[PDB]
Amino acid sequence: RWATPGHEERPKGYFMNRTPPAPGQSRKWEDWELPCYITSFLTIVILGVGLNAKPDLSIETWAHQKALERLEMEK
Amino acid sequence: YFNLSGLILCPVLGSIILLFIPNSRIRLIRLIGLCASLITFLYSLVLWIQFDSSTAKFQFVESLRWLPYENINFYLGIDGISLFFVILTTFLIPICILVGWSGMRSYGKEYIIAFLICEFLMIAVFCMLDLLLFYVFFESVLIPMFIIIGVWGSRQRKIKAAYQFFLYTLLGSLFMLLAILLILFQTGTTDLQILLTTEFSERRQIFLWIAFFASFAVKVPMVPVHIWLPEAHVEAPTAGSVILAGILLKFGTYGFLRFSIPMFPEATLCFTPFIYTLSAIAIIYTSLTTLRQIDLKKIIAYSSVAHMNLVTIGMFSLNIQGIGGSILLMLSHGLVSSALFLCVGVLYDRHKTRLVRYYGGLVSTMPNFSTIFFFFTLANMSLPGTSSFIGEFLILVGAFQRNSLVATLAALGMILGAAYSLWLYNRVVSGNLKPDFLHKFSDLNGREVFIFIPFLVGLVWMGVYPKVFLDCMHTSVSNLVQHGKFH
Amino acid sequence: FRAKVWSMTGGPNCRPKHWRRNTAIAMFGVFLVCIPIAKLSAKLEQRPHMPVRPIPSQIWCKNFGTKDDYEKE
Amino acid sequence: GRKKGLPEFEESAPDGFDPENPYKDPVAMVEMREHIVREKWIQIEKAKILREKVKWCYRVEGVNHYQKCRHLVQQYLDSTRGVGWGKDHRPIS
Amino acid sequence: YEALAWLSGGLGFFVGLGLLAVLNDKASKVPFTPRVYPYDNLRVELGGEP
Amino acid sequence: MYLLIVFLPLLGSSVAGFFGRFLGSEGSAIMTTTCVSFSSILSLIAFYEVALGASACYLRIAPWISSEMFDASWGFLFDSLTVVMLIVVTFISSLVHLYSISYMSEDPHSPRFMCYLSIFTFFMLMLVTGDNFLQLFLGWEGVGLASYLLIHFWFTRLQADKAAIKAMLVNRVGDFGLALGILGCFTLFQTVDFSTIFACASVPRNSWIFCNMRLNAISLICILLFIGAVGKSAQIGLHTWLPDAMEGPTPVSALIHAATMVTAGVFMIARCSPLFEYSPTALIVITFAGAMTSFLAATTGILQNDLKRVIAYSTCSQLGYMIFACGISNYSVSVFHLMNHAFFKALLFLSAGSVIHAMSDEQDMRKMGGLASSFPLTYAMMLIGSLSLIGFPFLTGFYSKDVILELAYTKYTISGNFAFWLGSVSVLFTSYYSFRLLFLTFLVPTNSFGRDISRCHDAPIPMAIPLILLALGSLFVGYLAKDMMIGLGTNFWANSLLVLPKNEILAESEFAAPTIIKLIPILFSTLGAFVAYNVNLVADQFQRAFQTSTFCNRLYSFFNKRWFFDQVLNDFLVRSFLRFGYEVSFEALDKGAIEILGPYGISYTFRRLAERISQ
Amino acid sequence: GITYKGVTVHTPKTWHTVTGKGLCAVMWFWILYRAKQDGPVVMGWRHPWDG
Amino acid sequence: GGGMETNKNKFIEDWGSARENLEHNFRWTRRNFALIGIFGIALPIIVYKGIVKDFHMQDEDAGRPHRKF
Numbered sequence A: 001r002w003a004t005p006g007h008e009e010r011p012k013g014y015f016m017n018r019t020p021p022a023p024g025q026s027r028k029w030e031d032w033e034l035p036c037y038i039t040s041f042l043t044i045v046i047l048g049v050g051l052n053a054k055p056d057l058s059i060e061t062w063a064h065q066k067a068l069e070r071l072e073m074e075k
Numbered sequence B: 001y002f003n004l005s006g007l008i009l010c011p012v013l014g015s016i017i018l019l020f021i022p023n024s025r026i027r028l029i030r031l032i033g034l035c036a037s038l039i040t041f042l043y044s045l046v047l048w049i050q051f052d053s054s055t056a057k058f059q060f061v062e063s064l065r066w067l068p069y070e071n072i073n074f075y076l077g078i079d080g081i082s083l084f085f086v087i088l089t090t091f092l093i094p095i096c097i098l099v100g101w102s103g104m105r106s107y108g109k110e111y112i113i114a115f116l117i118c119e120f121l122m123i124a125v126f127c128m129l130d131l132l133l134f135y136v137f138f139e140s141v142l143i144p145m146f147i148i149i150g151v152w153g154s155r156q157r158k159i160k161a162a163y164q165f166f167l168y169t170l171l172g173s174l175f176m177l178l179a180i181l182l183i184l185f186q187t188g189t190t191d192l193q194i195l196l197t198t199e200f201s202e203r204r205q206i207f208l209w210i211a212f213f214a215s216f217a218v219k220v221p222m223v224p225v226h227i228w229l230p231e232a233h234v235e236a237p238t239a240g241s242v243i244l245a246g247i248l249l250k251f252g253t254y255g256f257l258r259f260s261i262p263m264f265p266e267a268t269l270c271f272t273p274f275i276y277t278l279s280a281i282a283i284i285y286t287s288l289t290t291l292r293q294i295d296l297k298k299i300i301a302y303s304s305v306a307h308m309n310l311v312t313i314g315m316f317s318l319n320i321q322g323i324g325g326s327i328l329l330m331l332s333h334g335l336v337s338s339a340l341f342l343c344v345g346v347l348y349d350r351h352k353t354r355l356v357r358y359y360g361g362l363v364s365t366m367p368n369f370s371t372i373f374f375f376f377t378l379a380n381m382s383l384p385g386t387s388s389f390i391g392e393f394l395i396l397v398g399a400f401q402r403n404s405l406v407a408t409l410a411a412l413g414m415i416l417g418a419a420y421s422l423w424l425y426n427r428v429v430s431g432n433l434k435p436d437f438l439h440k441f442s443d444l445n446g447r448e449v450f451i452f453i454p455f456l457v458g459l460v461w462m463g464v465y466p467k468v469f470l471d472c473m474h475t476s477v478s479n480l481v482q483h484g485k486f487h
Numbered sequence C: 001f002r003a004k005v006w007s008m009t010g011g012p013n014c015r016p017k018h019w020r021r022n023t024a025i026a027m028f029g030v031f032l033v034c035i036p037i038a039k040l041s042a043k044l045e046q047r048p049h050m051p052v053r054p055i056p057s058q059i060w061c062k063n064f065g066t067k068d069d070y071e072k073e
Numbered sequence D: 001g002r003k004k005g006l007p008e009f010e011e012s013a014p015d016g017f018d019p020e021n022p023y024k025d026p027v028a029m030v031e032m033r034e035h036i037v038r039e040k041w042i043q044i045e046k047a048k049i050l051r052e053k054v055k056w057c058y059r060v061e062g063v064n065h066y067q068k069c070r071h072l073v074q075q076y077l078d079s080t081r082g083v084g085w086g087k088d089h090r091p092i093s
Numbered sequence E: 001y002e003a004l005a006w007l008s009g010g011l012g013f014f015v016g017l018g019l020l021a022v023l024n025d026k027a028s029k030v031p032f033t034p035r036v037y038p039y040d041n042l043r044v045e046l047g048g049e050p
Numbered sequence F: 001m002y003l004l005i006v007f008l009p010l011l012g013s014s015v016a017g018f019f020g021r022f023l024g025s026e027g028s029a030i031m032t033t034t035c036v037s038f039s040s041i042l043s044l045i046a047f048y049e050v051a052l053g054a055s056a057c058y059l060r061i062a063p064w065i066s067s068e069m070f071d072a073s074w075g076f077l078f079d080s081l082t083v084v085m086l087i088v089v090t091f092i093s094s095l096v097h098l099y100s101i102s103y104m105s106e107d108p109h110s111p112r113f114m115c116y117l118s119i120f121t122f123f124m125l126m127l128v129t130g131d132n133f134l135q136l137f138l139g140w141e142g143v144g145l146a147s148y149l150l151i152h153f154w155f156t157r158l159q160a161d162k163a164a165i166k167a168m169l170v171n172r173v174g175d176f177g178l179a180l181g182i183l184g185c186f187t188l189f190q191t192v193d194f195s196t197i198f199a200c201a202s203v204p205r206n207s208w209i210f211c212n213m214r215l216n217a218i219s220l221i222c223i224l225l226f227i228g229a230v231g232k233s234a235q236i237g238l239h240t241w242l243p244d245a246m247e248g249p250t251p252v253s254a255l256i257h258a259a260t261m262v263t264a265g266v267f268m269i270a271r272c273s274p275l276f277e278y279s280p281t282a283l284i285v286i287t288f289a290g291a292m293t294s295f296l297a298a299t300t301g302i303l304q305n306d307l308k309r310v311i312a313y314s315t316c317s318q319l320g321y322m323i324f325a326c327g328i329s330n331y332s333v334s335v336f337h338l339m340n341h342a343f344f345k346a347l348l349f350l351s352a353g354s355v356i357h358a359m360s361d362e363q364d365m366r367k368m369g370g371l372a373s374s375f376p377l378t379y380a381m382m383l384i385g386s387l388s389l390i391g392f393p394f395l396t397g398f399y400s401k402d403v404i405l406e407l408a409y410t411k412y413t414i415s416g417n418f419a420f421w422l423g424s425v426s427v428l429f430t431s432y433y434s435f436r437l438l439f440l441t442f443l444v445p446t447n448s449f450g451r452d453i454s455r456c457h458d459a460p461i462p463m464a465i466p467l468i469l470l471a472l473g474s475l476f477v478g479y480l481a482k483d484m485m486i487g488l489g490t491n492f493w494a495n496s497l498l499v500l501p502k503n504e505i506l507a508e509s510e511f512a513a514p515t516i517i518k519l520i521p522i523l524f525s526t527l528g529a530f531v532a533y534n535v536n537l538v539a540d541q542f543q544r545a546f547q548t549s550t551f552c553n554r555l556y557s558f559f560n561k562r563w564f565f566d567q568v569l570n571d572f573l574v575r576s577f578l579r580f581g582y583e584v585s586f587e588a589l590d591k592g593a594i595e596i597l598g599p600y601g602i603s604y605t606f607r608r609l610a611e612r613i614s615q
Numbered sequence G: 001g002i003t004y005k006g007v008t009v010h011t012p013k014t015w016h017t018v019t020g021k022g023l024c025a026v027m028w029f030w031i032l033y034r035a036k037q038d039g040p041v042v043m044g045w046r047h048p049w050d051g
Numbered sequence H: 001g002g003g004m005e006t007n008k009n010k011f012i013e014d015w016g017s018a019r020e021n022l023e024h025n026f027r028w029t030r031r032n033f034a035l036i037g038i039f040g041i042a043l044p045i046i047v048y049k050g051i052v053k054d055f056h057m058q059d060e061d062a063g064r065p066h067r068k069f
């Protein structure tokens, strides 16, 4: 049974139970979708190029450099 | 110059615009409310960009006079701890708007008024350094939650549910107010920076610590007083009930961090075993009570009670890692419990039973809901790889380093967490399908599918890489642990 | 009633007609994203030991025999 | 409004704080409190760096790690006596 | 409740046979001597001081 | 390259689960199995470049928990010990994947099965390659999660649901000890990594303050770690789950019940070798528990009359043997028996599944009789596997059981002699019920029904190649690995396994053998063969059914109900917990007792005080 | 396989009998092969490797 | 058959909204006194004593005198 074509014209079930419209027209986005989608994109970009733009200043890297230049003073 | 003033003004403008909008224009009310909430969320996120996690002192502060002699005044600001709570508060509310989006016609515009009012109200709580006004906004959240529970409650028995949630809060609130009066009359002001630098009397320390504990033991469910949360929490709308365990439950627990631990260094040490002997038996008793439960909402609330009693152990165990783990666990719980109540409320909005007996075999249908529910149960199941486990592992580490006995009882909590949550999952969405009761039912559409996406991504992000959350607040936790003593 | 539910992981007997075409894409999809895992790992796998015999991993790796001392970490 | 480099607050000592009367100069007590943690994090970090020293020593030497890392094992065990706030033996800082 | 009566006997055999291994004292029945290493039982390569 | 060993099964599982509708029931079967086979080839390459080309590989991806001096990282430890288990897990996982595609061709929800299998493969790869306790803990919990998911593969099946739930609770109670162990060892070293504690793990010699009284520190840590390994090795403490775990599909059971999750608890001890040897107290209790569990399982399996149930007790007996091997500082025979076991019990599991699903899905001994001549292939396979199981002289299983029993005899400690006695008397039981399995099936008149025999169909070719590979393995691997890894000081382990100078008894385990004890377990094996053949083939007129008055039916029930553990433990612990969670906590603590302050407690109090105040 | 009064057994395929026989004969030969070369190891008589 | 809601069986409604209010039953009885005095005043006291004893033993090992608490 590794050569016969499948007996399925389309994957069963509807994605989010939303019945596709007649062919040719769009999905008719809902009122909440557009602001929520643009805010999701803004969140993604802010957390992407904002988090990996903040200088690494903390109590960890400052202490790291300080102890790296202070453990070497054993004499 | 994205300061804290705008973060509080924006929800106020959103509420004010909504007040003068006709009820007929239901299209505009929801759109503008959601837009205001999302703008507030982005304005909170941008603060994380300019946080400057280096200084021990406080971040952006706004000072507004409140008394003729500038004795006490509105003094804003975050240090390292309330920042994440502000972000999560600004993030949960748009989810509240989205979950109650379809049925807004019956709710009206008054539904969004209460939510936005509580929104900037809880925003003004976390970033409020002045001690007294912290109490003013700490109990200001009574009215919005009272209204949400009562006006849009599910069943008719909501009348008795709200009374407990109110009066239990008022008792502790006024008990704290007396301590605030004693502190102000003794010291002279209530500004946090000064009041942390005042030599107190040991006999006075114990009484004031008890007075603060009078209310802070009600917000976090303790053994003597935890009846209000289940009764007044099963009987609230899903959009509203998702922040009783979301932000309304983190006031007292976080209030311990800001107004109890550095405030009374010599009293928390003397009262440490009492908190241990309360929370350790709470995590056992509440967890056992959870097993013999039938309502779908109450089990999640009891699991939340157990999680808060667990985080209380790790908070009073003064460790640089204990407090950080407490904050991580509180954020993770705010995510997972919110997700779980949405998951158990989407079932109610379709069938309206709230009984595990009727539910069964929900894997043969609505599989996406089953997958989401399984993921959030695993998150509540305390598995490594999710943000929770990072949460309670540090709690256990901090407790064991101080006391060996308390750690074993606390870990009994995560042992017993597999007895009720997994049983609920296998008894709701993995049983034998029964067509007698659930004749017909749909699956999640595009709204609730997108609702869980931020929850899932934040859960995984803070579970596999919690570095940024710990990176942003190592200075503040270090300053909080080292206080009063000099060794 | 099985056709009504989506069953995101596939239905019970989900047998698409062009399943071979999708499997070819899926296998190609794994390979194309597997290269970044292999490429990013080349800057890793520090093994200070030198094997007694040559292995075939010297072409894409250089983190062996270099991290000898432990006084400048 | 900062330089692109790592910040440096102060290193020598806070002059205002007097141990005999800890609550005498509130302005300088917070400086002492923050200086304590900013100096204890240095010890924590050097403990971490010596931990990685030991870890790479065990990862290089082989079976003879009971006689070629004892000079670092004794430098680790004594560094955990007063590191951070982790065990009831608080360091005498 | 009758099962607990069988439970005591079932584990009793294990511990009872465990005690019997004490009544024979196979420790003193070794046919050889304790193992010895050079250099103070390999003191340098097991710790101590160089 | 080394990241491809671990991440490819996860990637295959994720893509199969997310796009199980884009790929048919065979697309995922040929895709996930191909990815797992590629991972197996990568593991073989790593074994060639590490085990023989002795140079361990080390790495660190990113910091997981970057708190203060609690450095948690995503690094892995590609060590000589680890790569052997890489081979063991990858080869068996790929063979099981090939095995399942034939079995699951009729089971509807096919792609979900390979999705779960690949999740398990990824989790245990993460566990074995791990180098930090907490980062090993995610694999430890993920193995249990995948075990639950796979036993819960049949959501309709009520028995599977209860079995899965009980397995999760008992495994949680088990690894409670290990979970305590991570932070127990952390409070003495202020670190969680492996390379920084195995460097100096003998220095600490202080005590602690536990719940009741002050005890030792290292010994307590090792005790906690062993209690954690109890949950994932079905020891005397909590072994309620494995006997009831075979309520799900068969191909997974060849991978979860007898091949790999078997290795988790023993590999806990094996990985942390230079921690238990410095805690002699923990070693002795480990030996006691291992011997007790091995004997208990060996005498448990004999009465049961099911294919999967009895062999689960054989697996538990091997668990006890391996736990003892890890309890006497003789970890060499532990890993050697692990490698042998993953062959000669996975093979038997595949054979049992092949004969079960080809006989109208029946797994019984009382009902099914003999059909050996109907098909010789998988019976020859299972006969080879059984011969390895008893450890016939000069076979794969002999080279492990013989040496482990000799090591048990040599050590004269109070636990060595007792556990050697227990192992010697358990050899008789294991050789008895193994041949009982060989005899009650395929060597008796057929007692089955007349419809199932007509509907007979042998093992398909794709499911027979894994059996062929396992048969080829567990006939030469024992001879090939006897010299190279247990050879009196073989130089490939390096730091992977460390044995203290004091407790090193290997040379006198071979050159001081009395020759009257080394070859005795073969004598118990042949005696068990004789008695089993006599009872189950000829002398069964009275030796089979005992219709006496008393003390003989109860003897039957005592071992059938496995020492009433499922009865006494249930009623006295979980039934009591469920009773007192409703009649104590919900009665005299919160609801009813202190509720005299909420509704109907003070509400009626102010319906009298406030009333008599207007007048 | 020929059909009877209830047992209409199907004969095993060509490769499900000869493969089994020719693979089991290997193990049967290997038992004696290891009992001859390395056989003298564990018997108590004639210890090999310079003995 | 067009009702998405449950049928709300009569025998299940009482079972549901009976355990929700147990104040009437759990007011005054003999077993309640024993249960409360053995699991709300007894166990918390025992565990508190255990915790303070553990703190005292930790103090003694370090040598510092135990705090009054």
Ligand SMILES: CCCCCCCCCCCCCCCCCC(=O)O[C@@H](COC(=O)CCCCCCCCCCCCCCC)COP(=O)(O)OCC[N+](C)(C)C
Residues within 6 Å of the ligand: B363, B364, B365, B366, B367, B368, B370, B371, B374, B375, B378, B383, B384, B385, B386, B460, B464, C002, C005, C007, C008, C009, C010, C011, C012, F010, F013, F014, F017, F018, F109, F112, F115, F119, F142, F145
């Ligand atoms: C320790 C936590 C780690 C992170 C958690 C994720 C680990 C996997 C957890 C999910 C595993 C799958 C469990 C899904 C629920 C099982 C029951 C169920 O609802 O099945 C659904 C869902 O099916 C699935 O199993 C989907 C699996 C999706 C999960 C794939 C992701 C797993 C890998 C991610 C791990 C994280 C990777 C690391 C990230 C950095 C549909 O199955 P059907 O075959 O269609 O049968 C239903 C019957 N009927 C057809 C009639 C409707």
Ligand SMILES: CCCCCCCCCCCCCCCCCCCC(=O)O[C@H](COC(=O)CCCCCCCCCCCCCC)COP(=O)(O)OCCN
Residues within 6 Å of the ligand: A043, A044, A047, A048, A049, A051, A052, A056, B087, B088, B091, B331, B453, B454, B457, B458, B460, B461, B464, B465, B466, B467, B468, B471
């Ligand atoms: C189904 C479609 C869903 C689409 C989502 C994406 C699809 C993939 C989903 C899989 C899950 C991925 C989740 C992200 C995992 C990231 C793990 C590593 C993150 C990390 O620690 O590195 C940070 C990267 O910053 C970053 O850029 C991180 C950006 C992550 C954005 C996620 C936005 C979620 C917002 C949720 C808010 C919830 C609030 C709750 C409090 C900075 O690390 P660093 O400091 O070391 O910098 C380095 C300077 N040298």
